[PDB]
């Protein structure tokens, strides 16, 4: 199957999708792409709320039973949010990577990071995206 890229997303070449959901907030999880390739997803490590993070920085990793692969912050700014869901139900980034599936939130303080109109440059449209993939 082709894998979904929704078109109103932002993304990284390394599988993570960028959605503004706010004027200074993004959520942020793993493509469809990502999911599949990962196989069933039985662990999340996400960062503690408050947590601040660089552009590309590790902030987490996600596991299956076969691979664990890191998670990088897409734009800097602050993690204010996490998806709770994930502890009990891993699988949701398998079953809705772009719902359900969600990791997190980063907030942006356009003072001490880029604002978001900034951040946005640096990510690939849903074309740039599907371009990358194998």
Known sequence: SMSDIPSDLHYTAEHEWIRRSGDDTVRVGITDYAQSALGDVVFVQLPVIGTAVTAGETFGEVESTKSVS?????????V??????????????????????????????????????????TLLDAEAYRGTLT
Request: a negative charge.
């Open 80 to 121: 204010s949010e996490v998806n709770s869901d994930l502890d009990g139900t891993p699988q949701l980034v398998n079953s809705d990577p772009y719902g359900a599936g969600w990791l997190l939130d980063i907030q942006v303080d356009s003072s001490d990071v880029a604002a978001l109109e900034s951040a946005l440059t």
């Open 70 to 78: 890191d998670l990088y912050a897409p734009i800097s700014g602050k």
